[PDB]
Design a protein around this motif. Sequence first.
Motif, PDB file in Angstrom:
ATOM      1  N   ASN A  10      12.516  20.448  12.064  1.00 22.67           N
ATOM      2  CA  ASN A  10      13.880  19.996  12.141  1.00 22.67           C
ATOM      3  C   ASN A  10      14.449  20.277  13.534  1.00 22.67           C
ATOM      4  N   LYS A 104      17.983  24.446   8.841  1.00 26.57           N
ATOM      5  CA  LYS A 104      18.833  23.519   9.521  1.00 26.57           C
ATOM      6  C   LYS A 104      18.498  23.380  10.965  1.00 26.57           C
ATOM      7  N   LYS A 105      19.144  22.417  11.572  1.00 31.04           N
ATOM      8  CA  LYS A 105      18.931  22.044  12.943  1.00 31.04           C
ATOM      9  C   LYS A 105      19.185  23.185  13.896  1.00 31.04           C
ATOM     10  N   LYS A 110      18.857  26.303   5.112  1.00 32.70           N
ATOM     11  CA  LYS A 110      19.372  25.271   4.200  1.00 32.70           C
ATOM     12  C   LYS A 110      19.275  25.852   2.799  1.00 32.70           C
ATOM     13  N   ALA A 121      14.100  19.182   7.388  1.00 36.70           N
ATOM     14  CA  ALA A 121      14.471  20.560   7.108  1.00 36.70           C
ATOM     15  C   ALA A 121      13.401  21.287   6.314  1.00 36.70           C
TER      16      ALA A 121
HETATM   17  C1  LIG Z   1      16.070  13.559  11.485  1.00 33.70           C
HETATM   18  O1  LIG Z   1      16.583  14.034  10.803  1.00 33.70           O
HETATM   19  C2  LIG Z   1      17.983  14.656  10.379  1.00 33.70           C
HETATM   20  O2  LIG Z   1      19.240  13.998  10.557  1.00 33.70           O
HETATM   21  C3  LIG Z   1      20.140  14.541  11.523  1.00 33.70           C
HETATM   22  C4  LIG Z   1      21.454  13.862  11.239  1.00 33.70           C
HETATM   23  O3  LIG Z   1      21.800  13.638  10.043  1.00 33.70           O
HETATM   24  O4  LIG Z   1      22.199  13.468  12.235  1.00 33.70           O
HETATM   25  C5  LIG Z   1      20.306  16.057  11.358  1.00 33.70           C
HETATM   26  O5  LIG Z   1      21.249  16.137  10.064  1.00 33.70           O
HETATM   27  C6  LIG Z   1      22.094  17.264  10.126  1.00 33.70           C
HETATM   28  O6  LIG Z   1      23.415  16.848  10.388  1.00 33.70           O
HETATM   29  C7  LIG Z   1      23.856  15.888   9.454  1.00 33.70           C
HETATM   30  C8  LIG Z   1      25.210  15.340   9.890  1.00 33.70           C
HETATM   31  O7  LIG Z   1      25.422  15.641  11.252  1.00 33.70           O
HETATM   32  C9  LIG Z   1      23.945  16.525   8.073  1.00 33.70           C
HETATM   33  O8  LIG Z   1      24.312  15.546   7.126  1.00 33.70           O
HETATM   34  C10 LIG Z   1      22.611  17.145   7.671  1.00 33.70           C
HETATM   35  O9  LIG Z   1      22.789  17.935   6.517  1.00 33.70           O
HETATM   36  S1  LIG Z   1      22.676  17.774   5.144  1.00 33.70           S
HETATM   37  O10 LIG Z   1      21.213  17.853   5.112  1.00 33.70           O
HETATM   38  O11 LIG Z   1      23.217  18.964   4.405  1.00 33.70           O
HETATM   39  O12 LIG Z   1      23.041  16.580   4.381  1.00 33.70           O
HETATM   40  C11 LIG Z   1      22.049  18.007   8.796  1.00 33.70           C
HETATM   41  N1  LIG Z   1      20.686  18.395   8.490  1.00 33.70           N
HETATM   42  S2  LIG Z   1      20.250  19.931   8.594  1.00 33.70           S
HETATM   43  O13 LIG Z   1      20.232  20.269  10.014  1.00 33.70           O
HETATM   44  O14 LIG Z   1      18.924  20.034   7.993  1.00 33.70           O
HETATM   45  O15 LIG Z   1      21.251  20.704   7.864  1.00 33.70           O
HETATM   46  C12 LIG Z   1      19.015  16.839  11.063  1.00 33.70           C
HETATM   47  O16 LIG Z   1      18.310  17.088  12.297  1.00 33.70           O
HETATM   48  C13 LIG Z   1      18.042  16.159  10.092  1.00 33.70           C
HETATM   49  O17 LIG Z   1      18.298  16.466   8.702  1.00 33.70           O
HETATM   50  S3  LIG Z   1      17.200  16.388   7.596  1.00 33.70           S
HETATM   51  O18 LIG Z   1      17.857  16.303   6.275  1.00 33.70           O
HETATM   52  O19 LIG Z   1      16.362  17.608   7.586  1.00 33.70           O
HETATM   53  O20 LIG Z   1      16.316  15.177   7.764  1.00 33.70           O
END
Ligand SMILES: CO[C@@H]1O[C@@H](C(=O)O)[C@@H](O[C@H]2O[C@H](CO)[C@@H](O)[C@H](OS(=O)(=O)O)[C@H]2NS(=O)(=O)O)[C@H](O)[C@H]1OS(=O)(=O)O
Length: 129
Positions: A10, A104-105, A110, A121
Amino acid sequence: KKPKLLYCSNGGHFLRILPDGTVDGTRDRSDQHIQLQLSAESVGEVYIKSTETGQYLAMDTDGLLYGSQTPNEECLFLERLEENHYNTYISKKHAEKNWFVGLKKNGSCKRGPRTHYGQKAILFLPLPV
Ligand SMILES: CO[C@@H]1O[C@@H](C(=O)O)[C@@H](O[C@H]2O[C@H](CO)[C@@H](O)[C@H](OS(=O)(=O)O)[C@H]2NS(=O)(=O)O)[C@H](O)[C@H]1OS(=O)(=O)O
């Protein structure tokens, strides 16, 4: 055998079990709390153990990861190969709920309920040392 590091797709964090007992990720590969020993109950069931503190990865009854002092049922994970060749780790106790180990990112946990198949994630690359 092993140990390994678990590298999350992630944000590129190694899964870490802190002396705190809290779990998170760090990008620093010379961190001493990311070296992990995996052992198998049964085929595709693992415990994940910090080799620095001897804590075990565990997920609690509402989806948060913590480091446990003993290998109890909340410490069993289902390791499943995905494409390719990252693994995912489903909580065995909450398997029916699709609760995965996830970062998380920014490298913080998470929550199990916030995880699901297809997220970056939940994908971890085991790198044998
Ligand atoms: C490539 O993959 C992902 O998508 C990114 C994105 O949605 O812009 C990034 O997501 C993080 O931020 C978004 C909104 O800015 C959140 O919606 C997301 O969280 S949520 O999973 O609770 O719905 C968040 N993901 S997190 O960092 O895992 O919390 C992220 O790099 C990627 O998320 S993913 O779900 O692992 O694919």
